[PDB]
Design a protein around this ligand. Structure first.
Ligand SMILES: O=P(O)(O)OC[C@H]1O[C@H](OP(=O)(O)OP(=O)(O)O)[C@H](O)[C@@H]1O
Ligand SMILES: O=P(O)(O)OC[C@H]1O[C@H](OP(=O)(O)OP(=O)(O)O)[C@H](O)[C@@H]1O
Lengths: 162, 166
């Protein structure tokens, strides 16, 4: 019900003929939903449920995509979880000595979320897993699991109705 | 110091004094991000900035990344009428998130020093046809930012002042 409402809002808000960054070939603009009053609340609530079995006190990722996902999780009802942001180094709550959830809005390569995992690691945080709003079946899952980390997402590529 | 009026004085109560506590503890020698990205302080920030700006008409809230962002999302997530958010990039789209064109907008900032960051976000919004109804900050530090904001004919309001920070 929530997941269905979220998926509808994402197709509606974020699946927007286009010359890409690539030079190739709709495109997905996840920030239209992560910065939307309702979608962002659903994101916060579903991401908590998605990672309930994990142990972490602090959530964040690489600016900019990850930031409203992290704060949406911090604000959504439930137990206290603080937030941070990785610049391009760490801002917001202390991750040093901490259990950290790394988030992304949607990964392509996983580089961004990884840059974020390593920036956390290089200052002493322990990363427990990576969670994203939308997986797009692009290899990010695989790249992330190739460093010992669990990867999960709320929605998959099917939910985008492509 | 160039002391400016702190409109947040008038909404005294438990929420304001708790937040002032949290900002002294987490942020003071001053790192506001520790409060803006903190679960309780951010939630109070959302509640209070909504209250501070209740007589203002806007449907979207945001400012210049990074400082503005957790203040904007805090407002968006707090209880009450639906308010969406956006983020002005330092460079690029330039404005990311919800649509601001033809909208009434609140620009926010965690704390301003010169006012340059907030005025940058304001101008970026105007340039894409958004209407900025004011600027609100969490903490004013009597630095002259409020005057620079007001010199363009914008309204300005803050929740806390220097005195709330010790
Ligand atoms: O790094 P990858 O796993 O390939 O992911 C592609 C990235 O593209 C977007 O961020 P973008 O590069 O647009 O930067 P922004 O977050 O500053 O907009 C999105 O948030 C992804 O993190
Ligand atoms: O003189 P002003 O333009 O009013 O600037 C005041 C800003 O300075 C600080 O951030 P900082 O610029 O250090 O970091 P950021 O740009 O990454 O938010 C603070 O968070 C305010 O946003």
């Amino acid at each position: 019900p929530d997941r269905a409402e979220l998926a509808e809002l994402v197709r509606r808000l974020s699946v927007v003929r286009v010359t890409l960054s690539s030079g190739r070939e709709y495109y997905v603009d996840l920030r239209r939903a992560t910065l939307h009053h309702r979608a962002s609340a659903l994101i916060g609530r579903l991401m908590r449920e998605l990672t309930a079995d994990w142990d972490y006190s602090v959530v964040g990722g690489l600016t900019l995509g990850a930031d409203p996902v992290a704060t949406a999780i911090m604000h959504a009802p439930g137990r206290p979880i603080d937030a941070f942001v990785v610049r391009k180094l760490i801002e917001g709550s202390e991750v040093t000595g901490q259990r950290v959830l790394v988030v992304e809005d949607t990964s392509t390569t996983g580089n961004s979320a990884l840059t974020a995992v390593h920036a956390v690691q290089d200052v002493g945080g322990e990363v427990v897993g990576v969670a994203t709003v939308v997986d797009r079946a692009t290899g990010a899952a695989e790249a992330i699991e190739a460093e010992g980390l669990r990867y999960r997402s709320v929605l998959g590529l099917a939910d985008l109705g492509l």
